[PDB]
């Protein structure tokens, strides 16, 4: 419970009566360790450390139109995958 597992939660700022709007948020495993040799080689741009990032992201979404006249993503499933930013 220290770090709740990544899941859907109703997003208050965009949710509306009868028609919510879920969002993925939560925790995911990650770590960092000394870069092994085989990679430090293929690494023309040499880096001494390695981190294996894994943020919470929607596995699927609808993308609806809401109040403000704009369109938001309405997540339906979630999982800890790669960090692509927004």
């Amino acid at each position: 419970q220290d770090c709740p597992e990544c899941t859907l939660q109703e997003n208050p700022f965009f949710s509306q009566p009868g028609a919510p709007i879920l969002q993925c948020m939560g925790c995911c495993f990650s770590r960092a360790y000394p870069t092994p040799l085989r990679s430090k080689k293929t690494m023309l741009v040499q880096k001494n450390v390695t981190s294996e990032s894994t943020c919470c992201v929607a596995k699927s979404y609808n993308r609806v139109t809401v109040m403000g006249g704009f369109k938001v993503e309405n997540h339906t499933a979630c999982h800890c995958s790669t960090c692509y930013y927004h």
């Binding site: 709740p4 965009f14 360790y33 040799l37 880096k47 943020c55």
Partner: protein, 107 residues
């Protein structure tokens, strides 16, 4: 995102073998949200388990047939947090070879 003891692997390309050191590093969980509204004006790096402070060390790596055993210096985690991997020192990937990966013979 505690700071736990793992087992890295140091290797001597020339001698076809690897040694196993029991050093301490970072691992654990961190909180992130996948924005429902994505403003074109990037970004928000998202936090991740990694290092805050890293002191170096060195160890003895046996030699062999035609090479004298030498010294190897390796990074060690001082303290862990959920910051943003420092690209100016870290290879931030989704999946790497792994701390204990031993490529006995290169290529």
């Amino acid at each position: 995102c505690e700071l736990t003891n793992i087992t890295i692997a140091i290797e001597k390309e020339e001698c076809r073998f690897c040694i196993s050191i029991n050093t301490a590093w970072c691992a654990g969980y961190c909180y992130t949200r996948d924005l429902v509204y994505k403003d074109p004006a990037r970004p928000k790096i998202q936090k991740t388990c990694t290092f805050k402070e890293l002191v170096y060390e060195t160890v003895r790596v046996p030699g062999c047939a035609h090479h004298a055993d030498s010294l190897y210096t390796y990074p060690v985690a001082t303290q862990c947090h959920c910051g943003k991997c420092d690209s100016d020192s870290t290879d931030c990937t989704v999946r790497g070879l792994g701390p204990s990966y031993c490529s006995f013979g290169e290529m």
